[PDB]
Amino acid sequence: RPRFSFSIAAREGKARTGTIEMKRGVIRTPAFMPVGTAATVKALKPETVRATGADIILGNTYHLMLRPGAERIAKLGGLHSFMGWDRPILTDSGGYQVMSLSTKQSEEGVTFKSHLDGSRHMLSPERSIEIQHLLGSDIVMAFDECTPYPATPSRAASSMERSMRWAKRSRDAFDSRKEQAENAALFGIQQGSVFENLRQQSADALAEIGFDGYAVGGLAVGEGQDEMFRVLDFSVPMLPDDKPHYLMGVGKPDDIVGAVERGIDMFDCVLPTRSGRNGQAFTWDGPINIRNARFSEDLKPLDSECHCAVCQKWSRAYIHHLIRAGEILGAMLMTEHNIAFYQQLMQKIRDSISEGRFSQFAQDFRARYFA
Amino acid sequence: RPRFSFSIAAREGKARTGTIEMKRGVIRTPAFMPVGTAATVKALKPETVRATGADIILGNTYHLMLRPGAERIAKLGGLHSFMGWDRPILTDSGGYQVMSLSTKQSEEGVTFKSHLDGSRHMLSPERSIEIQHLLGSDIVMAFDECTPYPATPSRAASSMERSMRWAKRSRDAFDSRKEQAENAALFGIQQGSVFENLRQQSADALAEIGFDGYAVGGLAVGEGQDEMFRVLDFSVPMLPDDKPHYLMGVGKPDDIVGAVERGIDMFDCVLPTRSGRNGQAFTWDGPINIRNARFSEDLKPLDSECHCAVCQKWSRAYIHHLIRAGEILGAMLMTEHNIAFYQQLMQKIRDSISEGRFSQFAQDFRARYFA
Ligand SMILES: N=C(N)NOCC[C@H](N)C(=O)O
Ligand SMILES: N=C(N)NOCC[C@H](N)C(=O)O
Ligand SMILES: [Zn+2]
Ligand SMILES: [Zn+2]
């Protein structure tokens, strides 16, 4: 099987659909990656994650380096063996969580205090890559410096420039590890805040280094959908067309559809899992709050067109009861349904692009979802 | 299919093994019933409960009458449909929880305040039977008055006598409901605390009324194993031999083995589910606390002879991590393993009795479990 082979089977406007072939499996694009931060997609066995249609999941360098620890995971046989997921895993590099959850920053990297116990740790391009090697992930993210929003052009520029130096260091560290270079892929992260000239400079620097894929970083950090879409409008075309484009930490269903319309191939977000546990279910007519009294005697499934196992077997009324009672099975069923909904959305996106009817799909989807 | 047909296939001493045939399935005895108090066996889908080997689960009249409500469950199609478990369900009558979790007691019944919101409710033999009819349970428990431990002989006698009057009222209420009388079974509950003469009077009263099965009530309420076993020694032989004998709210694996040696056919307890969520796993070498540091790098499964799906797929080290991190999947995996362990114990009990080697099994089991 190939290390990394991206094929585009069809286009419609800026939208693309295709496949990434890797040693542990094929990833159908556009793809949604369930988030499995602490070596679990919360409340789901791996087999259930797969049954929803997911091809790849996300793990987090920052959380796993603290608990259970990267060298421990490697000693236990790697992340895939540890958690029982044998398909591809993408790991974020830690650079965002170190800033959001922990700190001393310099050109070498970041030192920080753990949010679990205040112990001191270090991340750097070289250490992030080494941790991801120890975990055994299939798609490795370059280590970046995250730019707060809003930022002055000058602060966004200096942060982007450091990120680009760290991208080169990440490339070199990855290429020095034969096992990683032979079996994994490395993605670079474009920065530059909302500024077109900086996004261009960042894209140029990343392409000069060369990566297997390119993430648009620094968005979905408080700017709102209109601004995110404006930035994607000019930023995605700057990236190499022939490699996957990954929008990190996005998003709501309508964010996904609009980002695909702008050339994004891959997504991750905690929304389906987190909001499932908190009682929000996604439906083709928009989200519902299952705890609401209107569902107490509703025998319909969460969504009456959903193909998932939850909607084949249990009612809104039952799941309403479970969530109100604090029952673990409520979190399990809501999470399975939401991840399945996201995967069915991605499938409809892929099919509509392949069939040359994605523009109509997006319009039909919005009209109903927001009615 | 029969409403209720109990067959004893084999005996060894006072131990029996056999089957209870009911309309929704066969119950192999001795049987362990996972507890599904609030219309869920905590952290398990019904299909997973079945996959562990369980033939029947327990629901609770007290909890379900408060949330979601008995008439609501009936309007939604009954408890089996509501929760997605299509095999037999036994429901306790509410008489113990009303005293332990809520109260005004009289000959008519009990009035009490809900533990959820302080609202006022009533239970009586007639209302308990009606609630169990609305739920649709397959085995209905008579409504009893629970005797605290310790109790004077005179207080135990007056409580037992009231329970026997309530047993007759339960019988009559059940027999007045054609649907229930045709499709469900009714069990009576022996009382009398630790006193042989009262246990005899209680057994005689229950047999005169006539029930499909007989529970030994009022034990495992603080008296300890030695005293519980002493009382079982004389109490079980007083019950009709040709009907199932049910020990309610028991227990640890060694409690089960000793109770089977004394003629008990059926058990329920929250221990495997509750202690699973709290990090205690049952093994053939005794319980382990999976959170203990000694398991942090242990690649063995929870138990290296267990047949369950958890022990085929995940290590102690992984489950240790999950429970320490507060992850729902930890509770799911620990609970599945513990319920599977209990079912494998019951299977070994059944096979050993059938094969005339239960005495040796019990000795071998204890020697290892307590080594
Ligand atoms: N930047 C890193 N390493 N992770 O991404 C975090 C998600 C955020 N939306 C972003 O795109 O930055
Ligand atoms: N008594 C009723 N209704 N429920 O049983 C509660 C369990 C307790 N061990 C008992 O045997 O009483
Ligand atoms: Zn669904
Ligand atoms: Zn097991």
Considering only CB atoms, which chain B residues are within 8 Å of A76? 297, 299, 315, 317-318
From B108, B72, B184, select the one nearest B176 (Cα to Cα).
Answer: B184
Verify cis geometry, omega within 30 degrees of 0, for the bond prior to A150. Answer: yes
In a mutational test of the pocket of ligand 1, which residue from A189, A191, A235 has the highest number of ligand atoms less than 8 Å from its CB?
A: A189
To the question of whether residue B191 is assigned a binding role by annotation, the answer is yes
Cα B369 from Cα B371, distance rounded (Å): 6
Decide: helix, strand or coil at residue A175.
Answer: helix
Considering only CB atoms, which chain A residues are within 8 Å of B77? 299
Give the residue carrying structure tokens 């009606």: B130
Dig out the tokens for A230 from the structure: 């404006």
Please provide the DSSP assignment of A69-97 as one string: -HHHHHHTT-HHHHHT--S-EEEE-SHHH
To the question of whether residue B212 is assigned a binding role by annotation, the answer is no
Cα A306 from Cα A304, distance rounded (Å): 6
Residues linked to residue A237 through DSSP beta bridges, in sequence order: none
**Which of A44, A45, A135 is the best mutation test for B, with the most CBs of B within 10 A?**
A45
Task: Say which CATH number the domain at B162 has.
Answer: 3.20.20.105
Cβ neighbours of residue B114 under 8 Å, at least 6 residues apart? Answer: B66, B102, B120, B121
Residue A19 to residues A7, A9, A362, A369, B101: CA-CA distances in angstroms? Answer: 5, 8, 21, 28, 57
Cβ neighbours of residue A309 under 8 Å, at least 6 residues apart? Answer: A51, A336, A340
Give the residue carrying structure tokens 């135990």: B156
- Measured in angstroms, how far is the CA atom of residue B309 from the centroid of ligand 4? 6
Residue type, B321: H
Minimum-distance ligand to the CA of A190? 1
Cβ separation B318–A45 shorter than 8 A = no
Q: CB contact, 8 Å: B183 with chain A?
A: no
Contact A341, A303 (CB under 8 A): yes
Contact B268, B233 (CB under 8 A): no
Q: Is the CB of B94 under 6 A from ligand 2?
A: no
Cβ atoms within 10 Å, residue A93? 25
Contact A198, A157 (CB under 8 A): yes
Considering only CB atoms, which chain B residues are within 8 Å of A273? none
Cα B332 from Cα A272, distance rounded (Å): 20
Dig out the tokens for A369 from the structure: 């979802």
Please provide the DSSP assignment of A184-198 as one string: -EEEEEE--TT-HHH
Dig out the tokens for B318 from the structure: 């992984």
Dig out the tokens for A234 from the structure: 């000019």
Phi, psi dihedral angles at B193 (to 5 degrees)? 55, -130
From A10, A26, A13, A6, select the one nearest A258 (Cα to Cα).
Answer: A13
- Measured in angstroms, how far is the CA atom of residue A50 from the centroid of ligand 3? 15
Dig out the tokens for A144 from the structure: 């970046």
Say which DSSP state A250 is in.
Answer: B
Decide: helix, strand or coil at residue B188.
Answer: strand
Considering only CB atoms, which chain A residues are within 8 Å of B314? 84
Pairing of strands B4-12, B57-60: unpaired
Dig out the tokens for A30 from the structure: 């556009």
Which technique?
X-ray
Q: Which of residues 255-284 of A touch B (CB under 8 A)?
A: 277
The 10 Å CB-count burial string (b at 16+, else e) for A274-295 is: ebbbebbbbbbeebbebbeeeb
> How many residue pairs bridge chain A and chain B with CB atoms within 8 Å of each other?
86
To the question of whether residue B84 is assigned a binding role by annotation, the answer is no
Contact B109, B122 (CB under 8 A): yes
Cβ neighbours of residue B267 under 8 Å, at least 6 residues apart? Answer: B30, B31, B32, B33, B246, B247, B250, B251, B256, B259
- Measured in angstroms, how far is the CA atom of residue A129 from the centroid of ligand 1? 16
B44 to chain A, closest Cα gap in Å: 6
Atom 4 of ligand 1: nearest residue by CA position: A96
Cα B282 from Cα B304, distance rounded (Å): 12
Cα B207 from Cα B193, distance rounded (Å): 18
Residue A223 to residues A160, A192, A218, A231, B252: CA-CA distances in angstroms? Answer: 18, 14, 10, 10, 57
Interruption sites in chain B after residues (C→N beyond 2.5 Å): 102
Contact A6, A213 (CB under 8 A): yes
Contact A76, B317 (CB under 8 A): yes
Cβ separation A328–B296 shorter than 8 A = no
Cβ neighbours of residue B214 under 8 Å, at least 6 residues apart? Answer: B187, B188, B189, B190, B203, B206, B239, B240, B243, B244, B245, B246
Nearest to A68 among B68, B321, B331 (CB): B321
B284 to chain A, closest Cα gap in Å: 24
Known catalytic membership, residue A351:
no
Pairing of strands B288-289, B280-281: antiparallel
Q: Which of residues 224-243 of B touch A (CB under 8 A)?
A: none
Please provide the DSSP assignment of A44-58 as one string: --HHHHHHTT-S-EE
Q: CB contact, 8 Å: A205 with chain B?
A: no
Cβ separation A297–B75 shorter than 8 A = yes
Q: CB contact, 8 Å: B222 with chain A?
A: no
Cα B319 from Cα B155, distance rounded (Å): 48
Residues linked to residue B22 through DSSP beta bridges, in sequence order: B4, B25
From A260, A165, A167, select the one nearest A212 (Cα to Cα).
Answer: A167
To the question of whether residue B94 is assigned a binding role by annotation, the answer is yes
Cα B101 from Cα B82, distance rounded (Å): 25
The residue range of the domain holding A248 is: 1-371
Cβ separation B328–A324 shorter than 8 A = no
Q: Which ligand 1 atom is at minimum distance from the Cα of A143?
A: 3
Cα B220 from Cα B178, distance rounded (Å): 35
Residues in chain B: 371
Q: Which ligand 2 atom is at minimum distance from the Cα of B250?
A: 9
Contact A292, A303 (CB under 8 A): no
Known catalytic membership, residue A268:
yes
Decide: helix, strand or coil at residue A238.
Answer: helix
From A91, A135, A45, A80, select the one nearest B330 (Cα to Cα).
Answer: A45
Cβ separation B82–A318 shorter than 8 A = yes
What number of CA atoms fall less than 13 Å from residue B83's CA on the CB side?
A: 33
Spot the catalytic one: B55, B212, B255, B268. Answer: B268
Cα B17 from Cα B353, distance rounded (Å): 6
Q: Provide the domain count of chain A.
A: 1
